[PDB]
Design a protein around this nucleic acid. Structure first.
Ligand code: AKG
Ligand code: MN
Length: 201
DNA sequence: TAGGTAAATCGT
DNA sequence: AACGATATTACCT
């Protein structure tokens, strides 16, 4: 197993991928992908958007979840049923049958884009797991421990892979190494990631 | 207030 | 390039 309370479900979302990508395009047509600026003033290499009741955003003051897209000043698009159903099935297979996400972050990685090591730790209810779906180009996923200097596991995530963490591993450090360039028939030149969370309640 | 918080980039 | 430091400091609440 990946870790205590963590599992990788390889190719779990492979069959659902084409529909998921159609719905990514639908979400992005309403709340476009954008590269967010950190409180410290650095632009993230990942381009992102959100769907569902809450969306992850940056302010000058820190990180926060908001029901409103600060770019459009409209609510984030509703979570697609394809997203919700896939998340439910993956969470159940991973041993979290009661997971009820209210937020889905959509990350887009161009070649060279990365996500430096971090914890998912601004959700008020840490009992709920993280469900993380990979689509398109492959990436090296780092999965560590509770401390930033804890040893990292390095796992290639390929199209359709789903990673779930929670319980003992809920606050584990993780990230994505700079994306290698390449081709995938469904995303062409990028990697998408769907990150489902219970961000409120 | 004065204790807590810095975490993406930079250096090795 | 895989790690560690970032603070023997600035910026807040
Ligand atoms: O893209 C991934 O696989 C990781 C995404 C992630 O950790 C995040 O967006 O917080
Ligand atoms: Mn994360």
């Amino acid at each position: 197993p990946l870790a205590a309370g963590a599992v990788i479900l390889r190719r779990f979302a492979f069959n659902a991928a084409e529909q998921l990508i159609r719905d990514i395009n639908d979400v992005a047509s309403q709340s476009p992908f954008r590269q967010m600026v950190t409180p410290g003033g650095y632009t993230m290499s990942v381009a992102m958007t959100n769907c569902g009741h809450l969306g992850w955003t940056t302010h000058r003051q820190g990180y926060l979840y908001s029901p409103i897209d600060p770019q459009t000043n409209k609510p984030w698009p509703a979570m697609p049923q394809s997203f919700h159903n896939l998340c439910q099935r993956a969470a159940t297979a991973a041993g979290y049958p009661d997971f009820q996400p209210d937020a889905c972050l959509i990350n887009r990685y161009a070649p060279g884009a990365k996500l430096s090591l971090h914890q998912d730790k601004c959700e008020p209810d840490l009992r709920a797991p993280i469900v993380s779906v990979s689509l398109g180009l492959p990436a090296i996923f780092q999965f560590g421990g509770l401390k930033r200097n804890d040893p990292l596991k390095r796992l290639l995530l390929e199209h359709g892979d789903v990673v779930v963490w929670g319980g003992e591993s809920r606050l584990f450090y993780h990230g994505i190494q700079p994306l290698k360039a390449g081709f995938h028939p469904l995303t062409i030149d990028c990697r998408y990631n769907l990150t489902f969370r219970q961000a409120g309640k």
